[PDB]
Amino acid sequence: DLPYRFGLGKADITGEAAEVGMMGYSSLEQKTAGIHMRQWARAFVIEEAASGRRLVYVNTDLGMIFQAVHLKVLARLKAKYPGVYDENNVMLAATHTHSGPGGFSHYAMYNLSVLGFQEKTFNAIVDGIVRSIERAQARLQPGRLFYGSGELRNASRNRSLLSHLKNPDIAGYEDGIDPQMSVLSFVDANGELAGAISWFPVHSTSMTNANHLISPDNKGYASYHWEHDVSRKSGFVAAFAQTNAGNLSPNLNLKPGSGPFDNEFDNTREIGLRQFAKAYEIAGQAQEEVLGELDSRFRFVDFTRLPIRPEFTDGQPRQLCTAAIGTSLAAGSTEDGPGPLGLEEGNNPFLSALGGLLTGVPPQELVQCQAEKTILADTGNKKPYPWTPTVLPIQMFRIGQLELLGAPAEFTVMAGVRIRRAVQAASEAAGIRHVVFNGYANAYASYVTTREEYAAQEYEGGSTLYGPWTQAAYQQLFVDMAVALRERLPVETSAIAPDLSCCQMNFQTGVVADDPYIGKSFGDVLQQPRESYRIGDKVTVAFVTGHPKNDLRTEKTFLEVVNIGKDGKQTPVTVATDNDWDTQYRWERVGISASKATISWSIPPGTEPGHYYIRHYGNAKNFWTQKISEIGGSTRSFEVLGT
């Protein structure tokens, strides 16, 4: 028989496509205005031979998975699958894409630029994650797990080199880059690649703060290219996860010119391509088969004044400071949007309802505990609720000789490396040979910098919430969890994660009413395609539509490129959907309450020469009935010429 069983599942988690602040850039003005490609939850269920011990890892095309999401999906999994799933064996991570709708956190600080909690996006996310896990378990099949690694030196650059070089122990990271990519491949009973999870550090910020189209960014393109363009086996699921990318940017030049590009879409595709290429090469090598038990540990840790043993600090006992954000340099900002929550409370009704950024003075105890940080906002002391998390999840999965760490924050290269070495040192005797550090997991508590980097207070340091010893605390938490795994004892009793579902505000307007263009009806074609197009041309079409906020069209689409044959009379077969890289769905307000759906298609090489037409699906809400109806239209047919 085989050592393991695995199940690969995928579900739509795309949020509100129009008029909701995007998550990542903290830009008040960056609201969704369409979709380039959808966001997906990719679940990997791993079962272990004799026992049916189960582990679930889900990587999401999101900026991060906030505590609110974690708490909700687990509550559903625990209630619906009692005894099989709980916080011990469910890990949720994010690719950290900055092109998705926000508002799915329960902490004000992360909802600031979005003007609050966006329930519709939040629920689409928890439901999609749960759905991906149900689909993955439903596809449990026997197989083998392989682990391998390689180096990728051309897909990232350190955005805070000055701080990075402050670390004495950077042997192997002299240029600021963590070139290591790890790949856990899943091979079915026929020795065929069923899926894979690739781990490699680099912000998914190829799409800038000027973009308004939803997008999985570079990691999402890598996933897509493998699933849609490369793999011929279906049910194929490829996830591209993060490790320690706190100070790693994909824009190789310094903002929106990665390698030599000048273009964010080209940059997104190329960076995704390079990550895909490396992962594909590594997976093909099937370097080291994974074998051994499956195990896990989870613990909610209250960070408030958490005791840090002298061996992780400078030789003296320390206690974590309550959360605070300090100022730092940019100029505009940098790795893309506006910065250190300098969202000006003027156009922010949500910010003023909270009481402004600053309120009174941070206690003198907080000021010195925070050391070199010059506090801009004391988020930990905010009332009635702190704007940042205080109880955080620490989780480790043992998968054979592999240990997967789920860390609730963005860790700089060295912040993660140190934790990795420390955990690897503690797990050696247990048979662990590879420690995979997965940041952006289970919750989001900003940045983690090493004591040294923190002292320089560059962007990541300013956002290292709990003080100079935040990195040390995390290293102490993961080491203690690792020793527990090694000794087979429970980890300490979990603290309680605050449930904030009760007090969420929202100042972002929903859909009031939709109206067709004057004299038109929803679904009407405002712009018909040209008579014919050649391969490589971009077909642009437009429709009278309704606000996409009315319906996410989860597991569905706002458009379809349909092929009706060489003579135009064959059974219509759809060749492109709103998820595809080749298509784009854009929404724009026209008049007072009307709106336009602009759909574009870049005919890709390999397109069957023939007749095609574009179909649009939308939803419109009526003011009088408050009813949301389905709407749509289809353009006339155009011809695709062999080229």
Q: Which residues form the interface with ligand 2ED (CB under 6 A)? A: 25-26, 203, 205, 328, 330, 333-339, 459
Q: Binding site annotation covers 410?
A: yes
Q: How far is the CB of 337 from ligand 2ED (least distance, A)?
A: 3
Token digits of residue 344: 């000006």
CB atoms within 10 A of CB 495: 15
Residue among 249, 296, 427, 595 flagged as catalytic:
249
Q: How far is the CB of 257 from ligand 2ED (least distance, A)?
A: 16
Q: Binding site annotation covers 444?
A: yes
335 vs 580 by CB, closer to Mg ion: 580
The binder of 339, among ligand 2ED, Mg ion, Zn ion, none, by C-beta within 5 to 8 A per type, is ligand 2ED
Q: How far is the CB of 500 from ligand 2ED (least distance, A)?
A: 23
3-state secondary structure 261-287: CCCHHHHHHHHHHHHHHHHHHHHHHCC
Q: How far is the CB of 463 from Zn ion (least distance, A)?
A: 9
Q: Binding site annotation covers 225?
A: no
Q: Binding site annotation covers 280?
A: no
Token digits of residue 335: 């790795």
Residues within the interface to Zn ion (CB under 5 A): 410
Query: In this chain, which residue has its C-beta nearest to ligand 2ED?
Result: 333
69 vs 94 by CB, closer to Zn ion: 94
Q: How many helices (H) and strands (E) does the chain have?
A: 12, 34
* DSSP string over 26-75: --SS-EEEEESS--EEEEEEEEETTTTEEEEEEEESSS---HHHHHHHHH
12 vs 335 by CB, closer to ligand 2ED: 335
User: Is 249 known to be catalytic?
Assistant: yes
The binder of 158, among ligand 2ED, Zn ion, Mg ion, none, by C-beta within 5 to 8 A per type, is none
268 vs 333 by CB, closer to ligand 2ED: 333
Cα–Cα distance measured from residue 571 to residue 220, given in angstroms and rounded to the nearest whole number: 32
Q: Binding site annotation covers 428?
A: no
Which residues lie below 8 Å from residue 529, measured CB to CB, with a gap of 6+? 539, 540, 541, 613, 614, 635, 636, 638
Q: Binding site annotation covers 192?
A: no
Which of helix, strand or coil describes residue 185? strand
337 vs 380 by CB, closer to ligand 2ED: 337
164 vs 553 by CB, closer to ligand 2ED: 164
Residue 402 backbone dihedrals phi, psi, to 5 degrees: -105, 140
Residues within the interface to Mg ion (CB under 5 A): 578, 580, 583
Q: Cβ distance 408 to 393 under 8 Å?
A: yes
Residue type, 230: V
Q: How far is the CB of 126 from Mg ion (least distance, A)?
A: 24
Q: Cβ distance 386 to 354 under 8 Å?
A: no
Q: Binding site annotation covers 86?
A: yes
Which residues lie below 8 Å from residue 522, measured CB to CB, with a gap of 6+? 514, 516, 544, 545, 546, 618, 620, 629, 631, 632, 633
* DSSP string over 118-172: -HHHHHHHHHHHHHHHHHHHTT-EEEEEEEEEEE--SS-EETTHHHHTT-TT-TT
Q: Is 76 exposed, middle or buried (0-12, 13-18, 19+ CB in 10 A)?
A: middle
Radius of gyration of the chain (CA): 24
The binder of 25, among Zn ion, ligand 2ED, Mg ion, none, by C-beta within 5 to 8 A per type, is ligand 2ED
Q: Binding site annotation covers 203?
A: yes
252 vs 628 by CB, closer to ligand 2ED: 252
Q: Cβ distance 188 to 143 under 8 Å?
A: yes
Residue 112 backbone dihedrals phi, psi, to 5 degrees: -45, -60
3-state secondary structure 549-606: HHCCCCCCCCEEEEECCCCCCCCCEEEEECCCCCEEEEEEEECCCEEEEEEEEECCCC
The binder of 242, among Zn ion, ligand 2ED, Mg ion, none, by C-beta within 5 to 8 A per type, is none
323 vs 482 by CB, closer to Zn ion: 323
Q: Binding site annotation covers 95?
A: no
Q: How far is the CB of 504 from ligand 2ED (least distance, A)?
A: 23
DSSP H helices, 337-429, are 349-354, 364-369, 413-427
Q: Binding site annotation covers 229?
A: no
Cα–Cα distance measured from residue 511 to residue 3, given in angstroms and rounded to the nearest whole number: 52
Give me the residue label for tokens 């009704």.
Answer: 349
The binder of 334, among ligand 2ED, Mg ion, Zn ion, none, by C-beta within 5 to 8 A per type, is ligand 2ED
Query: In this chain, which residue has its C-beta nearest to Mg ion?
Result: 583
Q: Binding site annotation covers 582?
A: no
Q: Which helix (H) or strand (E) holds 10?
A: strand 4-12
Residue type, 91: M
Q: Binding site annotation covers 578?
A: yes
The binder of 583, among ligand 2ED, Zn ion, Mg ion, none, by C-beta within 5 to 8 A per type, is Mg ion
Cα–Cα distance measured from residue 95 to residue 201, given in angstroms and rounded to the nearest whole number: 10
Token digits of residue 98: 């900055």
Q: How far is the CB of 43 from Zn ion (least distance, A)?
A: 23
The binder of 551, among ligand 2ED, Zn ion, Mg ion, none, by C-beta within 5 to 8 A per type, is none
Token digits of residue 487: 């000794």
295 vs 335 by CB, closer to ligand 2ED: 335
Q: How far is the CB of 330 from ligand 2ED (least distance, A)?
A: 4
Q: How far is the CB of 271 from ligand 2ED (least distance, A)?
A: 14
Write out the binding residues for Zn(2+).
96, 203, 410, 447
Write out the binding residues for Mg(2+).
36, 578, 580, 583
Write out the binding residues for substrate.
59, 67, 86, 105, 444
Report the catalytic residues. 249
Write out the binding residues.
36, 59, 67, 86, 96, 105, 203, 410, 444, 447, 578, 580, 583
